[PDB]
Structure 1
Amino acid sequence: TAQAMAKRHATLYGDPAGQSQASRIIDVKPGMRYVNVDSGETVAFRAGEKIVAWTFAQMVRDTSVDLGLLMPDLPGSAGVRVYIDRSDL
């Protein structure tokens, strides 16, 4: 599937995480434009009662990705940009 391809591309940016492990919850709202996350940060993203969390990978350069690539089932995710900061490692 195209979903399998997308899942593979999303892996470049980290891995799904349990919600319990996030250090903050970001509410995904209409028109928010973007968020900023660090390499290694675990962030939960919430739309109503749905919550999906993610641990970002160690990026070799500052990069960005569409939240809808990482969490297509989260309402409102598509079009929100995630800027991920380069790893200090």
Structure 2
Amino acid sequence: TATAQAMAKRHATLYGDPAGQSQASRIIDVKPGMRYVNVDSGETVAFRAGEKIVAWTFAQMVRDTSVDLGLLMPDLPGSAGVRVYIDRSDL
């Protein structure tokens, strides 16, 4: 389990890095049934569920990619099942 959490954190690294919420350019409220969000390569986004806030800087992706928000932030309530579509990098 601790090992499964380590595995998930390693996989999550493909998609970017944790960031300070002070660094975010927007805060998205994670709501039941929201389905998905769209983010840009390199964008820093804070995700909020009540008083819990977790932020993330998306990596420069080689192609359009998507990922479950629950992989990036398992501790954020309501994150599982919300799809994150990350736009390919301009670079």
Partner of 1:48: 50
Structure 1 outlier segments of 4+, above 4 Å: none
After superposition, the CA RMSD in angstroms is 0.2
Unmatched tracts of structure 1, length 5 or more: none
Name the TM-score, length of structure 1 as normaliser: 1.00
CA distance in 1, matches of 2:59, 2:26: 17
CA distance in 2, matches of 1:88, 1:11: 20
Unmatched tracts of structure 2, length 5 or more: none
* Number of aligned residue pairs: 89
Structure 1 residue 29, shift from structure 2 partner: 0.0
Partner of 1:16: 18
Identity, % of aligned positions: 100
CA distance in 2, matches of 1:78, 1:20: 24
